[PDB]
Design a protein around this ligand. Structure first.
Ligand SMILES: Nc1ncnc2c1ncn2[C@@H]1O[C@H](COS(=O)(=O)NC(=O)[C@@H](N)CO)[C@@H](O)[C@H]1O
Ligand SMILES: Nc1ncnc2c1ncn2[C@@H]1O[C@H](COS(=O)(=O)NC(=O)[C@@H](N)CO)[C@@H](O)[C@H]1O
Lengths: 463, 461
């Protein structure tokens, strides 16, 4: 049921126990409670007091067990000398008393050991839900409180009232989201011709730009075990799960990934990277699956999406980690400006930061048909939260293994970008202007009506 | 559950009942039984007569159902006629009403028996295979026929070394300590290996686009019936189809080819004659369970594959020409990568349920020391069209069942193995084939600047 896979991995010896910075949080209790409330996370300040109590009791049981073991191991050596040194083997009641002391402590330990396991499991489960710290400049509050740091571009001015992405696509037969209920499901999309080329072009353009800027290219397994998701700070256990799961009966611990952050993290799990290699910048393109059951219609929310992701393992300094975030943001902003898109960079507030994020920058791009700015990219400094759980480490020249910092950002979310590109570059005739960067991949300056005859329904449902 | 989703679609009224070629089986039961046996599929000669018998019981029961129904209408009309001419008093009137009640009760009992027979005939019928080209060889994979052999085995001063060793040395592939992270037969490709996959897909896609293939993007999560339509069995006990938790989500299954999605696009929809032949190219992340049906990238659960699919004109020759066109494109791609490959006509046992003809290409992989399948090309004829209602409209306007052909343009895992093993060098470097040089950016893959990751884990003692 509600079991931390990471603790279970420690239990079977698969992985070590997650390390936590609980002592620092305990050192300032009033400050700690205030921080959590700002997060408005599942564990708000109300759930906090019980964890402190669980932690305190756990320490004591260990103390007792430690003392008992020292006494228990000691007596055996002492008796060994007595039988040989006495040279009437068991007559001295001291010999008799010593055996008795061992048995009573052994009995006490046999009772004590199960209680230690139950408590260790309990404290870790509550700790697993403990949120990351918040950067001082982070705006505090709901999405509305989020700050707008930089705005680039001007809203496209249209003579006509602009049409929506799906309408333009279906008219050009480049997007199909219709008659797909009994084949692929609700919110499922097929991209045809230019739409497919547009995705391929956007992914290839972003991949090439990042590869040139020193990103190391990688391919990630798309089916991954749940412990990794918990390590990335994603919640596999929760009821409104966005994570699709392979049938447990058929296969165990296999969960589809909604990003490549999870996969890239898996590569670094339980492994160390040399300080000299750091910083580590990596780029991956993956098919991403997210349930998102939690109601609009269109490509804005969909179950399957192809996304190019930027990930990095950075050095010890929190300041060193923050630099990567700004670099990632700069690149994110550059790709969008190069695509001719109007966008605004928002420092995210505590309520939207999420459990693993010290600071998050999200970029909203103007979509004319929606008439709204919508997240097209997310950038987050996860600091050591992910490193501590999955054991991503950096080894210094000295030989020391120390926890590393993880930064994650989105280069290309094909679904939303198509909406921005199609709606913004729309023309009254219904033609869409291929932005200059992608013109090479697409092969044209305008997406024009197709030569082909579109599919027509031959099903019984037609009325 | 154990239901054939296709029948349920008809039951729920979502789609029409699958049409089928069982009539040919009934016409020549002996000939069909010999053909079914040569296939060695789920069904067997002995199974066919029961299917033939089940058809007889169903059709006869339906004919009786119509006969009684005709009578019930006759009585109602005669009763209405008596009512117009004029009541309960009339002696025959009461008789007619009672006869009507009797026919109604008899129909009510007969109705369910027909439905049970329909499901039984259909579920066994859908396990019935497509026909085979006469040229198709008969027997196991041992009895394959080699249509063509291109290239020559690479010459090596050193003993050839395997892809996994070459990969780990250059840190382009990882299959180590992934058990608690992604599973066995799971792999991570890094640097040049990622570039090689990106290049192979982009190279293959580009050639196809230039030859006029239409680009497509297929939803990875698909409902089960489409798999059944393509001739794949999700209900099988040793299923190679990964299923999302049924309790959590309904009928969402992962795809092992894009064949399924592309078929869905054409399902229960019609194409115009002018468009034919319709050629589409898709790139898909393909997932396959493969429950023992050893290591390395030869058999893996996640793979990237570019698939050529086409819906052709009415003639079988129209389908066959596309198959040869598809193999031709496949052979060219392999050659342009400087690979030694053999084209094999697959025998009946290996054809598969929806296959009229299958041509597969095996490539020379030196470290293994054996040839290996990299491509499958097949003509499914009308088997898929009949099941998923993929149809074309003639100039007059008749809607008729189409023919579908499927072929693997590029399968990244096995091809990476051969290019790496075949183009290997003693220094441990691997030479980038000229076509892929632009994408990789180098003529040879050499040792990496970075330091390989080191396990900090507990399992080490
Ligand atoms: N259900 C969805 N439908 C469409 N696009 C989505 C969906 N979920 C996420 N995305 C896209 O993915 C972008 C980033 O996703 S995110 O979850 O916010 N953040 C991440 O994924 C980070 N792990 C880095 O990629 C969103 O801006 C949006 O562009
Ligand atoms: N488990 C696997 N591991 C690695 N490669 C695989 C695996 N399954 C299939 N492939 C690759 O995909 C190619 C085609 O596979 S196939 O099942 O024969 N044919 C199909 O996939 C058809 N659906 C057409 O694509 C194989 O030759 C091989 O190159």
């Amino acid at each position: 049921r509600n079991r931390n896979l990471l603790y279970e991995y420690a239990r079977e010896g698969y992985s070590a126990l997650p390390q936590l910075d609980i002592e620092r949080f305990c050192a300032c209790p009033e400050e700690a409670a205030h921080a959590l409330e700002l997060r408005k996370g599942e564990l708000r300040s109300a759930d906090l007091p019980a964890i402190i109590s669980t932690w305190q009791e756990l320490r004591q049981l260990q103390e007792q067990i430690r003392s008992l073991e020292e006494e228990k191991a000691a007596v055996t050596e002492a008796v060994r000398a007595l039988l040989a040194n006495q040279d009437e083997v068991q007559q001295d009641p001291k010999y008799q008393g010593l055996r008795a002391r061992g048995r009573e402590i052994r009995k006490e330990l046999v009772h004590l050991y199960p209680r230690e396991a139950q408590l260790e499991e309990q404290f870790y489960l509550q700790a697993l839900k403990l949120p990351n710290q918040t950067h001082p400049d982070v705006p505090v509050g709901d999405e509305s409180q989020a700050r707008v740091l930089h705005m680039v571009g001007d809203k496209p001015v249209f003579s006509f009232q602009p049409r929506g992405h799906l309408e333009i696509g279906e008219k050009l037969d480049i997007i199909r989201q219709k008659r797909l209920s009994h084949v692929s499901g609700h919110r499922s999309y097929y991209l045809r011709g230019a739409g497919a080329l547009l995705q391929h072009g956007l992914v290839n353009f972003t991949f090439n730009k990042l590869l040139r800027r020193g990103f190391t290219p990688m391919t990630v397994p798309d089916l991954l075990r749940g412990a990794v998701f918990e390590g990335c700070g994603m919640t596999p256990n929760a009821n409104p799960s966005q994570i699709y799961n392979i049938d447990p009966a058929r296969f165990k611990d296999l969960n589809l990934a909604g990003t490549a952050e999870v996969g890239l993290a898996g590569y670094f799990m339980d492994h160390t990277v040399a300080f000299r290699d750091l910083p580590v910048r990596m780029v991956c393109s993956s098919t991403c699956y997210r349930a998102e059951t939690n109601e609009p219609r269109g490509l804005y929310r969909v179950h399957h999406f192809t996304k190019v992701e930027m990930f990095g393992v950075t050095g010890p300094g929190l300041e060193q980690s923050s630099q990567l975030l700004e670099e990632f943001l700069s690149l994110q902003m550059e790709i969008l400006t190069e695509l001719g898109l109007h966008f605004r960079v928002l420092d995210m507030p505590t309520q939207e930061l999420g459990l693993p994020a010290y600071r998050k920058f999200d970029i909203e791009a103007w979509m004319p048909g929606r008439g709204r700015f919508g997240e097209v990219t997310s950038a987050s400094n996860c600091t050591d939260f992910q490193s501590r759980r999955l054991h991503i480490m950096f080894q210094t020249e000295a030989g020391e293994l120390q926890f590393a910092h993880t930064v994650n950002a989105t280069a290309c979310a094909v679904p939303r970008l198509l909406i921005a590109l199609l709606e913004s570059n729309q023309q009254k005739d219904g033609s869409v202007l291929v932005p200059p960067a992608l013109q090479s991949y697409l092969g044209t300056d305008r997406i024009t009506a197709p030569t082909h005859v579109p599919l027509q329904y031959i099903g019984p449902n037609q009325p």
